[PDB]
């Protein structure tokens, strides 16, 4: 609450790197209305539910499911999703390392078109064919990446990217064993890049495209599904680490205010970063003689094309570039540290024995080595196709499905009356009537309708937006299904060893709360728990 809401909880790579390119891909102004609609009704209530559920019983992601032991497969589905994110999230950081190390010059290498790697259609604003190209993304596409023409063309492994990835993983690991620039500063740099960028010629045309709604695309379930993914990704829902660090709070803590403040601050930061990004696109379209809708590419590297071009127009550009990329590195490292600490704690707690928890260093070393080896294919000539595949399939809508299943399990299996009496124990008042309504009828129905209309409107041979081959779509579907299949598969395991009779009483004996469910203190087990 105005202390940690700005040093973190709102600022990260999910606000300055993912939201701009998702918004640009999905239309720009046609993405804003579903974004706000699904923020108000479909993820402010769920953030509060997750925080209260974590804080009530002081348990992590696994072990909080004593409310209904049969549904423990929801906890394992968040570790599978977090494992996918933890692999490719540290490849975005190693790209920031590459730009940070390449800014230690007297002229920025992406400022002119006289470099040996530039084509004949380069066009800059400092110092023929069709569709003239800015110098900023030729550096990203022909020098940094050396992109190939297909996902099946592996090519050669890029040595500088591999070195930066190794450095990033070593830095992350060295802090797990032993252990300004947060709040204010991430906003000062953004304000500097925003004041310089609304004065340019053509910036207004990129702002109107960013805000003007398009009413012909509100009947598509794809846009609504993509808007739901970003809300849950940035807020941290269904990651698993939100419950773990909510369990350290005091019993009589006001998590309602914290949830509201954090949600609003995160939304404001995302929108402000979008304002910063979309002003540059208008200027690029103006001086390149193209339209704003087609000036750039709908890939995950929009932030590495627009941001370095803005820094080139500022006085003493290298000094600003160094600070910007150092800030990006720190922002990524904080989230990576949080995620890996949560994952290691969850792993050690489940396996816990006498040998384990005394060798926690070796588990941390094994996790870091395993995660470094899986990122090697993402540093080759076809590494951006794999990064886009794991960002659109592995963790896009599985988070929404898992959160919806958790909400349905808490309200309709445990009971809404019991949970409403539980919240009143922590706070002094019952939950607001708006939150009670947007917990039993609104959010589940909205998510259900989006999911149902996604598969009915499917099979157009068009929702495959990047023209991936046949096997890539199958691999993506396997990645997306490996996290939501942990929910029915664990239930089958639990139901095959629960003492009982034919499957009418075994269902009832497995969904009952455990004997040790409730507040985790003797002085707070008052009422229905004494
Ligand atoms: C829950 C995940 O956290 C984040 C998820 C996304 C972003 S993003 C897309 O905006 O870059 C930032 C954080 C993040 O770093 N957070 C730090 C701290 C866990 C988080 C948090 C903790 C709480 C609290 F209020 F419960 F304390 O509120 N937010 C969010 C995880 F912990 F697993 F990493
Ligand atoms: C041990 C876990 C935690 C992380 C692993 C860190 C190791 C594997 C890292 C640390 C620094 C890294 C090296 C740093 C620099 C280079 C130079 C580059 O031209 C080839 C890759 C290479 C040689 C990296 C390969 C892997 C490396 C040795
Ligand atoms: C088994 C029950 C409990 C859950 C339902 C699983 C199915 C129906 C859901 C869960 C996650 C969903 C997928 C998540 C992400 C994407 C990426 C998008 O580009 C195409 C649709 C696709 C592939 C979704 C289609 C349907 C999906 C596979
Ligand atoms: C596959 C993913 C999306 C999970 C699907 C579960 C959700 C979306 C479904 C399955 C069971 C359904 C609920 C079953 C019972 C009720 C009670 C009724 O008074 C209001 C509707 C409501 C609340 C339904 C709404 C949608 C629902 C919650
Ligand atoms: Cl966001
Ligand atoms: Na957050
Ligand atoms: Na952060």
């Amino acid at each position: 609450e105005f202390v940690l809401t700005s040093v973190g909880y709102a600022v990260g790579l999910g606000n300055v790197w993912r939201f701009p390119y998702l918004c640009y891909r999905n239309g720009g102004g046609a993405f804003m209305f579903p974004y706000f609609i699904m923020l108000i009704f479909c993820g402010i209530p769920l953030f509060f539910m997750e925080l209260s559920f974590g804080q009530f019983a002081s348990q992590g992601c696994l072990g909080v499911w004593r409310i209904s032991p049969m549904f423990k497969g929801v906890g394992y589905g968040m570790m599978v999703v977090s494992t996918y994110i933890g692999i490719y999230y540290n490849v975005v950081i190693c790209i920031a390392f590459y730009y940070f190390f390449s800014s230690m010059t007297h002229v920025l290498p992406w400022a002119y078109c006289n470099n040996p790697w530039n084509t004949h259609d380069c066009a800059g604003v400092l110092d023929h064919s069709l569709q003239r190209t800015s110098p900023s993304e030729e550096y990203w596409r022909l020098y940094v990446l050396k992109l190939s023409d297909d996902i099946g063309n592996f090519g050669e492994v890029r040595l500088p990217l591999l070195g930066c990835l190794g450095v990033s993983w070593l830095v992350v690991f060295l802090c797990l064993i032993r252990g300004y620039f947060t709040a204010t500063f991430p906003y000062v740099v953004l304000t500097i890049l925003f004041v310089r960028g609304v004065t340019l010629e053509g910036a207004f045309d990129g702002i109107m495209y960013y805000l003007t709604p398009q009413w012909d695309k509100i009947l598509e379930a794809k846009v609504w599904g993509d808007a739901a993914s970003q809300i849950f990704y940035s807020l941290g829902c269904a990651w698993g680490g939100l419950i773990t660090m909510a369990s350290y709070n005091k019993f009589h803590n006001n998590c309602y205010r914290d949830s509201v403040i954090i949600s609003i601050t995160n939304c404001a930061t995302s929108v402000y970063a979008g304002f910063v990004i979309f002003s540059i696109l208008g200027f690029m379209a103006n001086h390149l003689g193209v339209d704003v809708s087609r000036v750039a590419d709908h890939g995950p590297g929009l932030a590495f094309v627009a941001y370095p071009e803005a820094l080139t127009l500022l006085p003493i550009s290298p000094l600003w570039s160094l600070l910007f990329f150092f800030m990006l590195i720190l922002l990524g490292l904080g989230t990576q540290f949080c995620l890996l600490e949560t994952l290691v704690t969850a792993i050690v707690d489940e396996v816990g024995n006498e040998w384990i928890l005394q060798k926690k260093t070796y588990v941390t070393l094994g996790v870091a080595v395993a995660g470094f080896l899986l990122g090697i294919p993402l540093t080759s000539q076809a590494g951006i196709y794999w990064l886009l595949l794991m960002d659109n399939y592995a963790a896009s809508f599985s988070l929404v499905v898992i959160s919806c299943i958790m909400c349905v399990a808490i309200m309709y299996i445990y009971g809404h009356r019991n949970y409403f009496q539980d919240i009143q124990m922590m706070l002094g008042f019952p939950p607001p009537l708006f939150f009670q309504i947007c917990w039993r009828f609104v959010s589940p129905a909205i998510i259900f309708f989006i999911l149902v209309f996604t598969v009915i409107q499917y099979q157009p041979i068009t929702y495959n937006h990047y023209q991936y081959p046949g096997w890539a779509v199958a691999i993506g579907f396997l990645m997306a299904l490996s996290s939501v299949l942990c929910i029915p598969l664990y239930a089958m395991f639990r139901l095959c060893r629960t003492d009982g009779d034919t499957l009418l009483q075994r269902l009832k004996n497995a969904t009952k709360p455990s004997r040790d469910w409730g507040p985790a203190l003797l002085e707070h087990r008052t009422g229905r728990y004494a």
Side-chain angles (χ1 to χ4, degrees), residues 13 31 55 80 116 133 172 183 193 196 200 220 227 248 265 273 289 328 334 372 435 437 472 501 506 530:
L13 292 193
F31 185 78
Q55 174 183 152
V80 171
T133 300
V172 164
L193 286 179
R196 181 61 177 164
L200 302 163
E220 294 192 358
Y248 298 125
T265 305
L328 285 179
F372 162 73
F435 283 98
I437 290 171
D501 304 70
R506 277 194 309 242

Side-chain angles (χ1 to χ4, degrees), residues 37-38 41-42 224 441-451:
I37 290 298
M38 291 273 315
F41 298 97
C42 288
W224 285 88
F441 315 116
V442 174
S443 311
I446 288 187
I447 285 170
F448 175 75
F449 273 126
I450 280 162
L451 170 68

Side-chain angles (χ1 to χ4, degrees), residues 14-15 19 35 230-235 266-267 269-271:
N15 279 298
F19 176 83
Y35 184 77
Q230 183 58 28
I231 289 293
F232 285 60
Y233 189 92
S234 295
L235 277 185
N266 174 75
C267 181
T269 307
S270 281
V271 175

